[PDB]
Amino acid sequence: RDLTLLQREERLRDLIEKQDEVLTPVVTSKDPFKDNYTTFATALDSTRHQLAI
Amino acid sequence: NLVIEEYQRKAQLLIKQIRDMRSEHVALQNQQKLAEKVDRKISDKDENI
């Protein structure tokens, strides 16, 4: 039991650390990308509020 | 006959099973002493989940 449960929490921490390294950079880039991109989106949509004639 | 023979049948079965388990225990008790060197990050686990 205990040697099989240890081998499960072993592989759980391995599968976590292999994500944590890669999630942390993405999270540190989050909202300074979001708010630039939303400012860009609303400004870009204003170019389509304009029917051709 | 049935008492003298069946006492030998039931005993020889247990004389194997307890010798088999007496070696499997010793394999497990050495595999355990490989993991005891690695895991020092238990309290980290549920935070990092």
Question: Features of this protein?
Answer:
part of a larger assembly; 2 chains; A: 53 residues; mainly alpha; 2 helices; B: 49 residues; rod-shaped; cell cycle; microtubule; branching microtubule nucleation; spindle assembly; HAUS augmin-like complex subunit 8
How are the elements arranged and paired?
This is part of a larger assembly, with chains A (53 residues) and B (49 residues).
Chain A (H helix, E strand, L loop, with lengths): L1 H27 L1 H16 L8
Chain B lengths: L1 H34 L9 H4 L1
PDB class: cell cycle
Keywords: microtubule, branching microtubule nucleation, spindle assembly, cell cycle
Entry title: Structure of the vertebrate augmin complex
Kindly summarize this structure in a few lines:
Chain B: This is HAUS augmin like complex subunit 6 L homeolog. Chain A: It is found in: Cytoplasm; Cytoplasm, Cytoskeleton, Microtubule organizing center, Centrosome; Cytoplasm, Cytoskeleton, Spindle; Cytoplasm, Cytoskeleton, Spindle pole. The structure is cut from a larger assembly and holds chains A (about 55 residues) and B (about 50 residues). Helix content of chain A is about 80%, strand content about 0%.
